[PDB]
Amino acid sequence: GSDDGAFGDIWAYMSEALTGAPGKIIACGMLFSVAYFGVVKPNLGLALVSALMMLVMANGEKIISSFLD
Ligand SMILES: CCCCCCCCCCCCCCCC(=O)OC[C@H](COP(=O)(O)OC[C@@H](O)CO)OC(=O)CCCCCCCCCCCCCCC
């Protein structure tokens, strides 16, 4: 597809926000959630899943651009 047009600025902002502060705030929430839910049930496996989710977020722009040309 085309990255420009009437909605190019919205797409540019949203794609950058995935690895920017809005994406980092969500990623920080995953770590806080893992720590909090580990108080009663310590489960470091969820921390691994959270990291894999951050890896997906880091690759979100590439994944979207590959499917949607
Ligand atoms: C980044 C660091 C390298 C990653 C290292 C670890 C990766 C985690 C795998 C093992 C964790 C084991 C302990 C888990 C602890 C645990 O209990 O996890 C629970 C969590 C939920 O799993 P289920 O939905 O099977 O289980 C439902 C309940 O178990 C919820 O607790 O498991 C996963 O999400 C991990 C499996 C996904 C692993 C395969 C994902 C690949 C598909 C996605 C690929 C990307 C698609 C992108 C689309 C845009």
Author numbering: 1 to 69
Copy the relevant paper text.
DNA transfer is facilitated by a type IV secretion system (T4SS) nanomachine, embedded in the bacterial cell wall, which is extended by a long hollow filament, known as the conjugation, mating, or sex pilus. Structures of mating or conjugation pili from the IncF and IncW incompatibility plasmids have revealed that the pilins polymerize into a helical arrangement with tightly bound phospholipid molecules, forming thin, tubular filaments ~8 nanometers in diameter that can extend several micrometers in length. Conjugation pilins are composed of three α helices, α1-3.
We processed data using standard helical reconstruction in cryoSPARC and reconstructed a map of the H-pilus at 2.2 Å resolution (map:map FSC, 0.143 threshold), by imposing helical (rise 12.14 Å, twist 28.98°) and C5 symmetries. The assembled pilus structure displays an outer diameter of ~ 90 Å and a lumen diameter of ~ 22 Å, which is similar to previously reported conjugation pilus structures. Uniquely, we found that unlike the F and W pilin structures, TrhA is cyclic, formed by a covalent bond connecting the peptide backbone between the N and C termini. The density map unambiguously demonstrated the formation of a peptide bond between Gly1 and Asp69. The formation of a cyclic structure between N and C termini brings the α1-2 and α3 helical regions closer, likely contributing to the reduced kink angle. In the cyclization region, the main chain atoms of Gly1 and Asp69 participate in a hydrogen bonding network involving Lys24 and ordered water molecules, further stabilizing their structure. Our analysis revealed clear phospholipid density in the map, indicating a precise 1:1 stoichiometry between pilus subunits and phospholipids.
